[PDB]
């Protein structure tokens, strides 16, 4: 109810799931007396109400990004500026309520429901060369409270639940950038692999949002779900030749863009399917990331391959705008209490669900 | 005199024939090849020079492979085989119009022309259905060649016939690479296989456009690279490349990599490229099949572009570059058509700089 009580209900210690080093789930410790951060100059402090799970959670913990010299070495994604320090609270897709504010900040902001932009840009221009993110370079949302810069706490003009709002920021920002890098236009066709996953699903929605035609490549039993989120046609990964199946599901239209989230043994086939002068784009490869590329296929077909992470401020604004105009919708695949993080991430890794899993403090 | 000229054009000629896929025994020097009659909209030229390109060798070998098998025997056009044997190869053709076909001005006879090897196959500027002369159609390794009239360009230059046979395939390819990588004035390009055709072309073309080229080349080729406009030269076989390039540039970042080598250099090239950088290729002489770490591409926000040949607009610009003397010919050797096996043996070993030229006789 009251704003004053809220301001003074903020405890000195809190509950949080801590990442304590690289390795397996046992490296994630549920702790009961972690210092509540104090908002520095230009920061707010939010009471976390929801936080959405992403692949980067898992890969950062495993150290599964490899290095340029050794693709199987353990490393965080930030290969050249390691800002990961242990213990670290992970969690990128944070929603909460501002309960405290730091030095330069308007005290009128207290009480606001905010969606966190997880991005640390590290530049004033629109370059993505030095990016980092909350949950990697700085503590994230798998805790009861989180500090973050005021500019990053967005008030969204929407009637959605805190949980619903927590589904968007990492995967949909990443989705948008991919679609922007590939220059996907109204009326074009995008083939989306890993379509039932975080980014996959988002791209299907974001494709629709900009007037494009998505065709999902989905696991067995996930077809009807892909249709539900706006896919034009679905191709089941299991059986058949992919190229034939894509041909039939497309009804003949050539594939302008491939959005790949799987990679691995699928990669070469996607380059085969892609129309000449077509564009390939990726921000993750779950199957995975080291592929055999026949340069000749790339240049005889006049192809572009694009790799992309996260997104720009303008991309984020557009995402906020999409949420507000309801051009995309939240996909809640399940909800887990913070106290049951191990169960949450096990379920997360299995991927026997659609859309996104959300972690709530308790 | 005028009548004499209508009938003085021989009915047979000599030409090097590609008879099938294989080694050099597939190139038969033949003295009795029918001289093509020019069809509607065509000219017939007396070839005086023709430049050598990697495609000659690769089409001969069928070393393009297939989508399903990277090492199957295959010509470059994997989805429309217009290569029929015997074929006369040779892309970079210069000559003199001796005859004109059905809808074409008689006045053109006597003109000195540079052949545009491109078969566009579309009205628009899409390269999706391209072919070339010397592959889809007979090329310039012959005394005479027929071609569409509009692909026969009178260039406004005092350049020698041999000099002019330096440009069209490698420089069109290079232009497109730069176009596809969006290389802007002030930006730095790292060019590998820099002493070869496309390599050298890109060095010149980057300067033509205000960019700063850094050459990666063979041992003892530093001086030749500087002479054709390279800012700095890195010598390929002496130390870590990233460190060498580091030292070679001002420490300044690499915006674009133009790669014609691939193979063992590929992953290294991706390391060196600045985040948000652009990689562009049209051939990989040291190995076209490479292991790519998608993580490197996506964490670094990279683009990779594959490109081949170029557009009509790209070609017009090339002519302009030649006329305005913004680029110059790099003749590395001239060879007679009768000694083709020697010419290609030299061509394949790359112990030269610039382009190799085959003159009939
Ligand atoms: Cl990955
Ligand atoms: Cl190649």
CATH number assigned to the domain comprising residue A9: 3.90.180.10
Token pair, residue A218, equals 């989905």
Q: What are the φ/ψ torsions at residue A291 (nearest 5 degrees)?
A: -125, 160
Same domain? For A179 and A83 the reply is no
Which neighbouring-strand residues pair with B153?
B114
| Pairing outcome for strands B212-217 and B188-191 | parallel
Peptide bond connecting A113 to the previous residue in cis, omega within 30 degrees of 0: no
CA-to-CA dists, residue B44 to A206, B14, B99, B152, B206, angstroms: 55, 15, 5, 10, 35
First to last CA, chain A: 20
Same domain? For B14 and B163 the reply is yes
Q: Smallest Cβ distance to A307: which of B70, B300, B308?
A: B300
Helix (H) or strand (E) run with residue B294 in it = helix B294-299
Alpha carbons B133 and B75: distance in angstroms, whole number? 14
Same domain? For A293 and A347 the reply is no
Within chain A, what is the greatest distance between any pair of CA atoms?
67
Distance from CA of B239 to the nearest CA of A (A): 16
Token pair, residue B19, equals 């008879």
CA-to-CA dists, residue A266 to A278, A293, B30, B208, angstroms: 17, 12, 48, 41
Alpha carbons B56 and B93: distance in angstroms, whole number? 13
Same domain? For B263 and B183 the reply is yes
Same domain? For B164 and B176 the reply is no
CA-to-CA dists, residue A139 to A17, A136, A169, B236, angstroms: 11, 7, 16, 45
Q: What are the φ/ψ torsions at residue B81 (nearest 5 degrees)?
A: -75, 100
What is the B260 CA–ligand 2 centroid distance (Å)? 8
Token pair, residue B30, equals 């033949």
Token pair, residue B354, equals 């610039």
Same domain? For B283 and B243 the reply is yes
| Candidates B299, B300, B302, B307, partner chain A, best to mutate (most A CBs within 10 A) | B299
Closest chain B residue to the Cα of A271, Cα to Cα: B67
**Angle B345-B95-B203 from CA coordinates, rounded to 5°:** 60
Distance from the Cα of residue B216 to its chain's centroid: 19
Same domain? For B292 and B247 the reply is yes
- In contact, A66 and A75? CB cutoff 8 Å: yes
Torsion of CA B50, B54, B60, B65, to 10 degrees: -150
Using DSSP's 3-state secondary structure scheme, residue A195 falls into coil
Same domain? For A62 and A179 the reply is no
- In contact, B277 and B257? CB cutoff 8 Å: yes
Using DSSP's 3-state secondary structure scheme, residue A338 falls into helix
CA-to-CA dists, residue B195 to B17, B189, B345, angstroms: 28, 15, 17
- In contact, A68 and A79? CB cutoff 8 Å: yes
Token pair, residue A3, equals 């704003």
Alpha carbons B168 and A271: distance in angstroms, whole number? 29
Helix (H) or strand (E) run with residue B249 in it = none
Name every residue whose Cβ is closer than 8 Å to that of residue B289 and which is 6 or more positions away in sequence.
A292, A293, A294, A295, B70
Alpha carbons B201 and B228: distance in angstroms, whole number? 9
Closest chain B residue to the Cα of A297, Cα to Cα: B67
What DSSP line would sit under B166-179, residue for residue?
TSHHHHHHHHHHHH
For B20-132, where are the alpha helices, taking DSSP H only?
54-61
CA-to-CA dists, residue A94 to A91, A135, A356, angstroms: 7, 10, 13
Helical packing angle, B340-349 and B54-61, nearest 10°: 100
Q: What are the φ/ψ torsions at residue B329 (nearest 5 degrees)?
A: -65, 140
Token pair, residue A231, equals 């896919």
Q: Which domain holds residue A72?
A: 1-170+330-362
Name every residue whose Cβ is closer than 8 Å to that of residue A191 and which is 6 or more positions away in sequence.
A215, A217, A246, A255, A257, A258, A259, A270, A273, A274
Give the ligand with the smallest distance to the CA of B65.
2
- In contact, A256 and A184? CB cutoff 8 Å: yes
Distance from CA of A128 to the nearest CA of B (A): 8
What DSSP line would sit under A137-172, residue for residue?
TB--SSBSEEEEEGGGEEEP-----HHHHTTSHHHH
Residue A276's nearest CA partner among B127, B283, B176, B279 is B127
Residues of chain B contacting A, Cβ within 8 Å: 64-65, 67, 70, 76, 78, 126-128, 180, 262, 267, 270-271, 274-276, 281-284, 288-308
Q: What are the φ/ψ torsions at residue A266 (nearest 5 degrees)?
A: -80, -20
Token pair, residue A150, equals 């005021």
Same domain? For B13 and B153 the reply is yes
- In contact, A185 and A241? CB cutoff 8 Å: no
- In contact, B113 and B95? CB cutoff 8 Å: yes
Name every residue whose Cβ is closer than 8 Å to that of residue B305 and which is 6 or more positions away in sequence.
A298, A303, A304, A305, B177, B180, B181, B278, B279, B280, B281
E strands within chain B? 12-18, 27-34, 42-51, 87-88, 92-100, 112-115, 118-119, 131-132, 144-148, 152-153, 188-191, 212-217, 232-235, 256-259, 278-281, 289-293, 303-306, 331-336, 355-359
Q: Smallest Cβ distance to A309: which of B70, B262, B298?
A: B298
Long-range contacts of A102-109 (CB under 8 A, 24+ apart): A102/A38, A102/A39, A102/A40, A102/A41, A102/A42, A102/A43, A102/A44, A102/A45, A103/A40, A103/A41, A103/A42, A104/A41, A104/A42, A104/A150, A105/A39, A105/A42, A105/A43, A105/A44, A105/A150, A109/A44, A109/A150, A109/A153
Distance from CA of A354 to the nearest CA of B (A): 24
Name every residue whose Cβ is closer than 8 Å to that of residue B302 and which is 6 or more positions away in sequence.
A306, A307, B270, B273, B275, B276, B277, B278, B279, B296
**Angle A248-A266-B75 from CA coordinates, rounded to 5°:** 80
Residue A133's nearest CA partner among A156, A113, A145, A149 is A149
Alpha carbons B88 and B115: distance in angstroms, whole number? 15
Q: What is the CATH number of the domain that holds B179?
A: 3.40.50.720
Which neighbouring-strand residues pair with A260?
A282
| Candidates A302, A306, A308, A312, partner chain B, best to mutate (most B CBs within 10 A) | A302
Same domain? For A122 and A224 the reply is no
What value does the CA radius of gyration of chain A take, rounded to a whole number of Å?
21
Name every residue whose Cβ is closer than 8 Å to that of residue A288 and which is 6 or more positions away in sequence.
A263, A264, B294
Return the residue matching tokens 């779900």.
A225
E strands within chain A? 13-19, 28-35, 43-52, 88-89, 93-101, 113-116, 119-120, 132-133, 145-149, 153-155, 189-192, 213-218, 233-236, 257-260, 279-282, 290-294, 304-307, 332-337, 356-360
Using DSSP's 3-state secondary structure scheme, residue B47 falls into strand
Which neighbouring-strand residues pair with A53?
none
Same domain? For B44 and B100 the reply is yes
Distance from the Cα of residue A78 to its chain's centroid: 16
Return the residue matching tokens 């564009």.
A279
Token pair, residue B236, equals 């390929």
Alpha carbons B323 and B157: distance in angstroms, whole number? 5
Using DSSP's 3-state secondary structure scheme, residue B269 falls into helix
Same domain? For B313 and B186 the reply is yes
Using DSSP's 3-state secondary structure scheme, residue A198 falls into helix
Alpha carbons A302 and B79: distance in angstroms, whole number? 14
- In contact, A135 and A61? CB cutoff 8 Å: no
Which neighbouring-strand residues pair with A123?
none
Alpha carbons A92 and A94: distance in angstroms, whole number? 6
Token pair, residue A88, equals 């670290």
Total number of domains constituting chain B: 2
* Residues B333-357: b if buried by 16+ CB within 10 A, e if exposed: bebebeebeebbebbeeeebbbbbb
Alpha carbons B75 and B67: distance in angstroms, whole number? 12
Alpha carbons B188 and B138: distance in angstroms, whole number? 39
Using DSSP's 3-state secondary structure scheme, residue B306 falls into strand
Which neighbouring-strand residues pair with A89?
A18
- What was the elucidation method? X-ray
Residue B227's nearest CA partner among B259, B257, B187, B194 is B194
CA-to-CA dists, residue B119 to B64, B150, B174, B198, angstroms: 19, 11, 18, 20
Closest chain A residue to the Cα of B303, Cα to Cα: A306
Distance from CA of B67 to the nearest CA of A (A): 7
Helix (H) or strand (E) run with residue B198 in it = helix B197-208
Token pair, residue A83, equals 């800002």
């Amino acid at each position: 109810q009251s704003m004053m009580r809220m301001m003074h209900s903020v405890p000195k210690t809190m509950t949080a799931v801590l990442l304590t080093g690289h390795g397996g789930l046992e490296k994630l410790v549920y702790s009961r007396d972690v210092p509540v951060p104090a908002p520095a100059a230009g920061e707010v402090l939010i009471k976390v109400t929801a936080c959405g799970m992403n692949n980067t959670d898992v890969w950062v913990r495993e150290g599964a990004y490899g290095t340029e010299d050794d693709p199987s070495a353990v490393s965080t994604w930030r290969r050249h500026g390691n800002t990961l320090t242990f213990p670290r609270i992970q969690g990128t897709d944070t929603v909460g309520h501002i309960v405290a504010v730091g030095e330069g900040v308007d005290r009128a902001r207290i009480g606001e429901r905010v969606m966190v932009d997880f991005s640390i840009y590290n530049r004033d221009d629109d370059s993505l060369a030095d990016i980092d993110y909350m949950g990697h370079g700085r503590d994230g949302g798998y805790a009861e409270y989180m500090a973050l810069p005021a500019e990053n706490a967005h008030v969204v003009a929407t009637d959605l639940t805190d949980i619903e709002l927590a589904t968007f920021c990492c995967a949909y920002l990443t989705g948008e950038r991919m679609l922007e890098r590939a220059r996907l236009a109204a009326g074009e066709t995008v083939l989306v692999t890993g379509a039932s996953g975080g980014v996959g699903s988002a791209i299907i929605q974001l494709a629709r949002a900009r007037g494009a035609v998505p065709i999902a490549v989905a696991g067995p039993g996930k077809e009807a779900a892909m249709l539900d989120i706006g896919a034009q046609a679905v191709v089941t990964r299991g059986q058949g030749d992919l190229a034939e199946a894509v041909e039939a599901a497309s009804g003949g239209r050539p594939i302008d863009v491939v959005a790949d989230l799987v990679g691995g043994p699928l990669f070469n086939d996607l380059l085969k399917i892609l129309r000449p002068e077509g564009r390939y784009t990726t921000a993750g490869a779950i199957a995975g990331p080291v592929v055999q590329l026949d340069l000749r296929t790339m240049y005889l077909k006049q192809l572009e391959l694009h790799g992309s992470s996260q997104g720009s401020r303008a991309d984020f604004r557009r995402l906020v705008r999409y949420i507000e105009e309801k051009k995309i919708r939240p996909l809640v695949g399940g909800v887990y209490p913070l106290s049951e993080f191990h169960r949450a991430q096990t379920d997360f890794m299995a991927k026997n669900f659609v859309g996104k899993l959300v972690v709530v403090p308790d």
